[PDB]
Amino acid sequence: MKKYTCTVCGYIYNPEDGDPDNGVNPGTDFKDIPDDWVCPLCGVGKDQFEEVE
């Protein structure tokens, strides 16, 4: 699992940590995050994120 960054605000989704406050548990791959989840920082959707390669 890769980290992904919100290209609008620079928030990094790290799959080891998930986003548990918003119901994304540690170990969720980004592609498995429900498609209505938004960046916890700026609130934009998933389509503004890019795999950190």
4 or 11: CB nearest Fe ion? 11
The verdict on whether residue 6 carries a ligand-binding annotation is: yes
Measuring CA to CA, how many Å separate 19 from each of 5, 37, 46?
Answer: 13, 10, 13
Helix (H) or strand (E) holding 12, with range, is strand 12-13
Least separation in angstroms between residue 13's CB and Fe ion is 9
Q: Which residues bind Fe ion (CB under 5 A)?
A: 6, 8-9, 11, 39, 41-42
The verdict on whether residue 9 carries a ligand-binding annotation is: yes
Measured CA to CA, the distance from residue 9 to residue 12 in angstroms comes to 9
Binding region for Fe cation: 6, 9, 39, 42
